[PDB]
């Protein structure tokens, strides 16, 4: 192992991923996994190949990752949401939409079957929705145009119609929160900064792809954007990013996450405080806040973004964002403690079972690879592979539990022009070697073979490193999935 981690260091849980970016995160909790959906931040370049500032040109897909344990993330690749102005190569799902910003996600049992709803902002041109039968798709546009526009009843007054947050209440009723922006265009008055009145909540129909009645105004003081709704102990918590303009009182600090409570999902809400400081208060690279509060495996957390990957790569954040998660604490009086955002992040909550098929694109740490959609036959929905593997690169999983009996062998599905090796190491990238898998020439980068090799010394709970070596300079092989066999 020679390659180093960009930003997510071995033993640390933030950022969630660093092999690519992901902005404006939101969380779905579903059947033992947490899925994070993100805006498709990707590095933009000047004509001479130098990095430039993010201009949101690439924000036309939704990136999806998931975890059972908060440390190992499965990369589910990208939903080609926007389909206007070319797609997505003609493959965009929402043909009327040029962008898909700031996704929100919901699940609802309909007709005794779980259905999934992905919402997004078409820049400021309105909020759309796609549906699927799985949290990872495939996705359908059941409407063919925005779900909500400025002409939706109650939506008049919204300056920026974006950052959706959709909540399915305990009675099954869906609610959409959206909006932001500050009225008064170039120079808002002090009062316009303090009460923009651009936050909205609208009740959704039973089908989650229509609205009922009109939108209500949520008078979020110093509203900016980044609506959020969670429900704790019977109380609804509307959270949002506070704006940066005008003078601000001590209790409504610019750019921090504010929150309000109500006994009803549509209000009236009462301002309670703030629980997340600006990204730059904790990290390198600065940036504006975006967040979602969620309860996964019976603990409360907040997913948010920071510019921690671009900052490490370039020495400035340049508007490129990455996901983070930290614990969120409610007090006895229903207030929320300041979120201690950091790199350490959340300690692994359960072990990984190495004896099932584990996607190669399920990993906790990596020393510089990429993931992309795979040509491998079979595999889960939107199956990816690990690629851009050069000599010295590696990936690692946290706390694989080999058990007392330990592993007998190691299988890997690979595709290779020239061939190479996978070293299986415990604890560190230079750690105990338990096996070496010889990757043959398989016929090329799109011809797959599952290879098996011996393992010994793999018992109990360890980080596991897959260290890639070979003589070639470019790409040694593509790596789809692996599996250990029990002794």
Annotated binding site for Ca(2+): 359, 361, 383-384, 480
Annotation marks residue 338 as catalytic: no
Q: How far apart (Å, rounded) are the C-alpha atoms in residues 226 and 463? A: 36
Q: How far apart (Å, rounded) are the C-alpha atoms in residues 90 and 83? A: 7
Nearest approach, Cβ of residue 451 and Ca ion (Å): 15
Do 129 and 149 touch, CB atoms closer than 8 A? no
Radius of gyration from C-alpha coordinates of the chain: 23
Q: How far apart (Å, rounded) are the C-alpha atoms in residues 472 and 381? A: 32
- One symbol per residue from 281 to 320: x for binding Na ion (CB under 5 A), - otherwise; what is it? ----------------------------------------
Q: How far apart (Å, rounded) are the C-alpha atoms in residues 197 and 277? A: 22
Nearest approach, Cβ of residue 478 and Na ion (Å): 12
Task: Compare residues 348 and 371 and give the one whose CB is closer to Na ion.
Answer: 371
Which residues are known binding-site members? 288, 359, 361, 383-384, 480
Nearest approach, Cβ of residue 230 and Na ion (Å): 12
Task: Compare residues 89 and 377 and give the one whose CB is closer to Ca ion.
Answer: 377
Q: Is 383 in the site for Ca ion (CB under 5 A)?
A: yes
Task: Compare residues 18 and 480 and give the one whose CB is closer to Ca ion.
Answer: 480
Contact with Na ion (CB under 5 A) among 390, 413, 469, 478: 390
Task: Find which of Na ion, Ca ion, none residue 359 binds, CB within 5 to 8 Å per kind.
Answer: Ca ion
Find where tokens 């003081």 sit: 221
Task: Find which of Ca ion, Na ion, none residue 383 binds, CB within 5 to 8 Å per kind.
Answer: Ca ion
Number of chain positions touching Na ion (CB under 5 A): 6
Nearest approach, Cβ of residue 482 and Ca ion (Å): 9
Task: Find which of Na ion, Ca ion, none residue 388 binds, CB within 5 to 8 Å per kind.
Answer: Na ion
Q: Is 359 in the site for Ca ion (CB under 5 A)?
A: yes
Beta-strand ranges (E) seen in 93-210 are 101-110, 113-121, 127-132, 165-168, 174-179, 199-204
Burial class (CB in 10 A: 0-12, 13-18, 19+), 332: exposed
Q: What is the SS3 assignment for 11?
A: coil
Burial class (CB in 10 A: 0-12, 13-18, 19+), 462: buried
Contacts of residue 454, Cβ cutoff 8 Å, sequence gap at least 6: 408, 409, 410, 435
Number of chain positions touching Ca ion (CB under 5 A): 4
* Phi, psi at 290, each rounded to 5°: -145, 135
Applying CB under 5 A, which residues contact Na ion? 26, 102, 368, 388, 390, 393
Q: So which residues are the catalytic ones?
A: 24, 225
Applying CB under 5 A, which residues contact Ca ion? 359, 383, 480-481
């Amino acid at each position: 192992a020679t390659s180093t981690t960009i930003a997510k260091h071995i033993g640390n849980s933030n950022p969630l991923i660093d092999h690519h970016l992901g902005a404006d995160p939101v969380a779905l909790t579903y059947n033992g996994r947490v899925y994070i959906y993100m805006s498709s931040d990707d590095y933009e370049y000047n004509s001479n190949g130098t990095i430039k500032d993010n201009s949101f040109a690439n924000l036309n897909r939704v990136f999806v990752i998931s975890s059972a344990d908060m440390v190992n993330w499965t990369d589910h690749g990208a939903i080609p949401v926007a389909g206007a102005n070319g797609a997505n190569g003609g493959r965009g799902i929402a043909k009327w939409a040029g962008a898909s910003w700031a996704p929100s996600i919901a699940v609802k049992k309909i007709n005794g079957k779980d259905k999934f709803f992905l919402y997004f902002a078409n820049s400021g041109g309105g909020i759309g929705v796609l549906t699927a039968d799985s949290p990872i798709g495939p996705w359908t546009d059941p409407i063919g145009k925005p779900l909500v526009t400025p002409s939706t009843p109650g939506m008049s007054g919204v300056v920026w119609l974006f950052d959706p947050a959709v909540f399915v209440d305990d009675d099954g009723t869906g609610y959409l929160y959206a909006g932001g922006g500050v009225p008064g265009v170039s120079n808002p008055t002090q009062g316009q900064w303090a009460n923009p009145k651009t936050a909205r909540v609208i009740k959704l129909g039973p089908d989650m792809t229509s609205v009922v009645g009109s939108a209500s105004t949520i008078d979020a003081p110093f509203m900016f954007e980044d609506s959020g709704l969670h429900k704790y102990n019977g109380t609804y918590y509307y959270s949002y990013c506070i704006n940066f303009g005008g003078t601000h009182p001590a209790d409504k600090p610019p750019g921090e996450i504010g929150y309000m409570t109500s006994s009803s999902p549509m209000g009236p809400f009462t301002y309670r405080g703030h629980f997340l400081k600006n990204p730059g208060a904790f990290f390198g690279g600065g940036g504006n806040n975006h967040h979602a509060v969620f309860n996964f495996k019976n603990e409360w957390y907040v997913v948010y973004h920071a510019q921690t990957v671009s900052s490490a790569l370039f020495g400035a954040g340049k508007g490129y964002r990455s996901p983070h998660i930290n614990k969120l604490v409610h007090n006895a009086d229903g207030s929320i403690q300041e979120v201690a955002a950091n790199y350490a992040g959340v300690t692994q909550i359960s072990n990984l079972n190495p004896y099932n098929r584990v996607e190669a694109e399920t990993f906790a740490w990596n020393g510089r690879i990429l993931t992309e959609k795979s040509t491998a036959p079979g595999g889960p929905v939107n199956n990816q592979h690990v690629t851009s593997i050069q000599n010295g690169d590696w990936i690692a999983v946290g706390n694989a539990d080999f058990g007392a009996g330990g592993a007998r062998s190691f299988k890997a599905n690979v595709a290779s022009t020239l061939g190479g090796k996978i070293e299986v190491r415990l604890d560190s990238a230079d750690g105990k070697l338990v096996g070496t898998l010889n990757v043959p020439s398989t016929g090329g980068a799109q011809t797959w073979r599952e290879i098996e090799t011996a393992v010994s010394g793999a018992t109990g709970v360890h980080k596991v490193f897959f260290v890639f070596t070979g003589t070639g300079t470019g790409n040694l092989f593509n790596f789809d999935y692996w599996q250990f066999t029990q002794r």
